[PDB]
């Protein structure tokens, strides 16, 4: 059981969105 | 290092002219080695070892 060492070739970490609080809807 | 091959540089040239010509290069290379180990074990009894 040889333990492999892994790492990616690409350098594109997925562009994560940012979501902000909606406008003032109320209950 | 291991010297694979020397080159061929220069030649006998007439003294009347002012220039010279290129030779050809040699070849030098790189070598490595490693080491091995010898191993074993043996046992004794203290009383017999000390009273002998």
């Amino acid at each position: 059981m040889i333990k492999l060492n892994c790492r990616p070739l690409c350098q594109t970490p997925t562009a994560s969105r940012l979501v902000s609080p909606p406008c003032f809807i109320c209950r | 290092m291991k010297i694979a091959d020397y080159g061929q540089l220069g030649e006998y040239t007439c003294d009347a002219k002012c220039d010279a010509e290129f030779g050809e290069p040699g070849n030098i290379r790189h070598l490595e080695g490693k080491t091995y180990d010898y191993r074993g074990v043996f046992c004794f009894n203290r009383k017999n070892l000390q009273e002998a």
Binding site: - | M1, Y6, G7, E11, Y12, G26, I28
Partner: protein, 52 residues
């Protein structure tokens, strides 16, 4: 990490020695020292044949 300039100096000197040694033995006098075996001035002996 190696002295390539010194290696080339040594190689050039070695080539000079090797060429000089071939000269003085076989070189012709036009551009190289004339060699004794090429000049051919030493008296010569001629081995006897055999009727096989």
């Amino acid at each position: 990490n190696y002295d390539f300039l010194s290696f080339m100096i040594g190689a050039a000197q070695r080539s000079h020695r090797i060429n000089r040694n071939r000269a003085l033995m076989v070189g012709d006098g036009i551009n190289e020292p004339k060699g004794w075996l090429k000049e051919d001035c030493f008296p010569t002996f001629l081995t006897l044949p055999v009727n096989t």
